Amino acid sequence: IVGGTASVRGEWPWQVTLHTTSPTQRHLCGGSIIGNQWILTAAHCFYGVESPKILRVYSGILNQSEIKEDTSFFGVQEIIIHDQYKMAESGYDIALLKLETTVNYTDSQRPISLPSKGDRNVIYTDCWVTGWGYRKLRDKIQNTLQKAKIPLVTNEECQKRYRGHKITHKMICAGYREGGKDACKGDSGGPLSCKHNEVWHLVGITSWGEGCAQRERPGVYTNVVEYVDWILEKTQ
Ligand SMILES: Cc1ncsc1-c1cnn([C@H](CC2CC2)c2ccc(-c3c(-n4cnnn4)ccc(Cl)c3F)c[n+]2[O-])c1
């Protein structure tokens, strides 16, 4: 997260860190708890992932340094990638992880609600992107989970900034016109969380952008409301 600030323990309890263990263990992507055995993340995260065997899902983590050889994690039973996914920039950048056991919800690990389709005409004004990613383009994975408040952008404005890409209704864009706050490398797969009537909704999945926090280049997110039928179909 560029231009963000450190989070505190329990602040984003649906946020997980997905680690790969090949050839070494490291943070790979963010993700969101949406059910007791279900993580929603980005399909791009699994480029070069040989199988679910090498994945570990850690929940309730504030600092990456909390994760030691005895830290408990969830195994991944299945990776479900959208059938139309080809590359992040052309959409369908969404994946479900089915965990090998159920998350017991606690103050540190909690689900986030999906958007309502009856809530597709709501204007979200209180949206946040979170993650352990770079604070600038040539940086390092951060120890402490970072947060930034970022405004949503109309798809018409977003298409004007990305004339070489097809910005569709299945994407949502977010960023300041002058830049300065955005997701960056290592944040993808994590949530764009928006609060409405004091309830949090998983509105976007961090996906792609041209650089990080650049002027007039918003971040592009998978528009989760457009995938609710697909999610319910896979999780039922
Ligand atoms: C894990 C790790 N560890 C060290 S490096 C790195 C890394 C490099 N790439 N990644 C991921 C894609 C790879 C997982 C498959 C990525 C790509 C793009 C954006 C992004 C960007 N960025 C553009 N240029 N950099 N970021 C801007 C706006 C938004 Cl919304 C974004 F989602 C954010 N992540 O995480 C992680």
Which CATH number characterizes residue 70's domain? 2.40.10.10
| CA of residue 97 to ligand 1 center, whole Å | 19
* Partners of residue 33 on adjacent β-strands: 39
DSSP E strand boundaries for 60-214: 76-81, 95-99, 127-131, 146-149, 152-153, 171-174, 191-196, 199-208
Within 10 angstroms of residue 44's Cβ, the number of other Cβ atoms is 22
**Rg of the chain taking only CA atoms, in angstroms:** 16
Decide whether any atom of ligand 1 lies within 6 Å of the 185 Cβ: yes
Domain enclosing residue 85, as ranges:
15-110+232-235
User: What was the experiment behind these coordinates?
Assistant: X-ray
188 is catalytic: yes
- State the catalytic residue, choosing from 32, 59, 188, 207: 188
Catalytic residue, from 19, 27, 44, 196: name it: 44
Question: What is d(CA 41, CA 195) in angstroms, rounded to the nearest whole number?
Answer: 19
Q: Whose CA is nearest to atom 8 of ligand 1?
A: 185
Rounded CA-CA distance 72/74 in Å is 7
DSSP states of 195-230? EETTEEEEEEEEEE-SSSS-TT--EEEEEGGGGHHH
Among 185, 187, 208, 210, say which to mutate for ligand 1: greatest number of ligand atoms within 8 Å of CB. Answer: 185
Query: Cβ(95)–Cβ(79) under 8 Å?
Result: yes
DSSP 8-state assignment for residue 148: E
Annotated catalytic residue 44: yes
Q: What is the rounded CA–CA span in Å between residue 79 and residue 67?
A: 23
Q: How far is the CA of 197 from the centre of ligand 1 (A)?
A: 31
